[PDB]
């Protein structure tokens, strides 16, 4: 029937991050404050409806350059690590951009932390 | 600082499998008994050192067509879902091929079913 799905997905993700840090099989460039960072098209799409829509047919969606977004640097790291780097100064910014990106794990993570503070 | 959100792994692989279902951002074809199944190079590479190696330099990997390997029809589904159909009758074919593919998760599964004895 099945094996352990949370354990398996973890190993797969940890492997996709290792591929990234080595430029291995990366097929796009994710821009952050002007800076290029290699990434897997499939993974950005897996994380965000916005990126999904962008590779399928970009002409059809909102032309918003989020390259300079406050919190965006934290969002790319999360995608591949499932680790979020929040601080009292950056919670709102990360939340705002993840809400735009439609990334629910981060939305509820930030909401969770905000509720405690 | 850093907070772990491990459910996000399950989100990435679930969506990667959704992408495979709808024919999206797949860049390679996994062959079983001559049959073409669409997949992501990055997912296959993440799960198997054999596949990782095959997309890097196909010309200097052993010249063995494993399309007809007994148990290979078990592998692709597992990579995306962790779903696995082991049985007394098929454990060894799966193990044998899981070994060639360097897949520890599937090897461990096979050994566990074989322990019922
Ligand atoms: Zn696994
Ligand atoms: Zn640039
Ligand atoms: Zn269109
Ligand atoms: Zn600071
Ligand atoms: Zn997520
Ligand atoms: Zn063929």
UniProtKB/Swiss-Prot annotation, chains A, B:
Subcellular location per UniProt equals: Nucleus
Protein's name in the database: Zinc finger and BTB domain-containing protein 17
* Full protein: residues contained: 1 to 115 of 803
Q: Which family does it belong to?
A: Belongs to the krueppel C2H2-type zinc-finger protein family.
Expression across tissues is: Expressed in germinal center B-cells.
User: What does the function comment of this entry state?
Assistant: Transcription factor that can function as an activator or repressor depending on its binding partners, and by targeting negative regulators of cell cycle progression. Plays a critical role in early lymphocyte development, where it is essential to prevent apoptosis in lymphoid precursors, allowing them to survive in response to IL7 and undergo proper lineage commitment. Has been shown to bind to the promoters of adenovirus major late protein and cyclin D1 and activate transcription. Required for early embryonic development during gastrulation.
How this chain assembles, per its entry, is:
Homooligomerizes (via the BTB/POZ domain), multimerization is required for DNA binding. Interacts (via the C-terminal zinc fingers) with GIF1; the interaction results in the recruitment of MYB to the CDKN1A/p21 and CDKN1B promoters and repression of transcription. Interacts with TRAF2, interfering with the binding of UBC13 to TRAF2, and inhibiting TRAF2 E3 ligase activity. Interacts with MYC (via the C-terminal helix-loop-helix motif); the interaction inhibits ZBTB17 transactivation and growth arrest activities and renders it insoluble in the nucleus.
Which stretches make up the BTB domain? Answer: 3-106
**Can you name the source organism?**
Homo sapiens
């Amino acid at each position: 029937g099945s094996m352990d799905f949370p354990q398996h997905s973890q190993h797969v993700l940890e492997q996709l991050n290792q591929q990234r840090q080595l430029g291995l099989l990366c097929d796009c460039t994710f821009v952050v404050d002007g800076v290029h960072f290699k990434a897997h098209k499939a993974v950005l799409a897996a994380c965000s409806e916005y990126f999904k829509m962008l590779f399928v047919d970009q002409k059809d969606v909102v032309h918003l350059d989020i390259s300079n977004a406050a919190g965006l640097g934290q969002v790319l790291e999360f995608m591949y690590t499932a680790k979020l780097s929040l601080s009292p100064e950056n919670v709102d910014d990360v939340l705002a951009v993840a809400t735009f990106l439609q990334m629910q794990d981060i939305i509820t993570a930030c909401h969770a932390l905000k509720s405690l503070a």
